[PDB]
């Protein structure tokens, strides 16, 4: 059918891997293994339309810095997480991550979500700011361990990559 | 992926898997494996396009990966295996094409078997 790209990226320790995991898996992982790169596939119907969604899992460490730009080409939409708990990674979207991805991928839709949202800290308008500073299709939050927000997140993701 | 058999603790093994396919080259390339009843952990991995840069999970040296350009294949050593190493063991490749979008390939995979 319509096979869509998705690469999540956000600072260490954001929610990244356990966002991806508890959307295709139904199952939150406990043990914190940061991750190198993996990959993972999961199907899913927004709109009526039937899409097959590549999830795309990177790292947020810096030892991986090099790694991570080889997952970024023919992504069709951007997962740009930071943690609602860490304010910092929140101010690492400006200086980091969006710089990153508008040069590697300069026209894909971003999504700005606010991982572990059961934390609450980063307001919801903070967020919302800073959705609108750096240019998103939409910001939204969710949180892996209470399984809410997450379907709405990437039902966003797969509007945006319809696009 | 090839290179699995069956070793004592303590033993030897190295796996062997193709750089790249034929239509179409790898920019990355990944080893994964699969414990029975535990989930898929990352084992190690190297890049292509940027410089050859090797990427480990323990940095306790158990693990090499290496490439034979020769032969076009990765090789993965594993020294000093333990019954904690039983699994199957997977390849990745980051798949880059002329007429293809960047995809992710999984290999099929090879069993590993440590006595005890």
């Known amino acids: 059918a319509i096979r869509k790209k998705l690469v999540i990226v956000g600072d260490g320790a954001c929610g990244k891997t356990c966002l991806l995991i508890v959307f295709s898996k139904d199952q939150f992982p406990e043990v914190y293994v940061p991750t190198v790169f993996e990959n993972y596939v999961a199907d899913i119907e927004v709109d009526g339309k039937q899409v097959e969604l590549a999830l795309w899992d990177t790292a947020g460490l810096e030892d991986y810095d090099r790694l991570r730009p080889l997952s970024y080409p023919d992504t069709d939409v951007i997962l740009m997480c930071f943690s609602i708990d860490s304010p910092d990674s929140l101010e690492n979207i400006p200086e980091k991550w969006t710089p990153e991805v508008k040069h590697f991928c300069p026209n894909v839709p971003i999504i700005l979500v606010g991982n572990k949202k059961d934390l609450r800290p980063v307001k919801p308008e903070e967020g919302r700011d800073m959705a609108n500073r750096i240019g998103a299709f939409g910001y939204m939050e969710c949180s892996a361990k209470t399984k809410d927000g997450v379907r709405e997140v990437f039902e966003m993701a797969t509007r945006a990559a319809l696009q | 992926a090839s290179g699995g058999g069956f070793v004592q603790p303590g033993g030897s093994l190295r796996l062997s898997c193709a750089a790249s396919?034929?239509?179409?080259?790898?920019?990355?390339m990944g080893w994964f494996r699969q414990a029975p009843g535990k989930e898929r952990e990352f084992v190690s991995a190297?890049?292509?396009?940027?410089?050859?840069?090797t990427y480990y999970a323990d940095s306790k040296g158990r693990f090499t990966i290496s490439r034979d350009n020769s032969k076009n294949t990765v090789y993965l050593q594993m020294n000093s295996l333990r019954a904690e190493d039983t699994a199957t063991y997977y390849c990745?490749?980051?798949?880059?094409?002329?007429?293809?979008?960047?995809?992710?390939?999984w290999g099929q995979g090879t069993q590993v078997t440590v006595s005890s």
């Open positions: 190297i890049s292509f396009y940027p410089t050859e840069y």
């Open positions: 396919g034929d239509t179409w080259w790898s920019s990355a």
């Open positions: 990745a490749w980051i798949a880059w094409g002329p007429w293809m979008r960047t995809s992710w390939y």
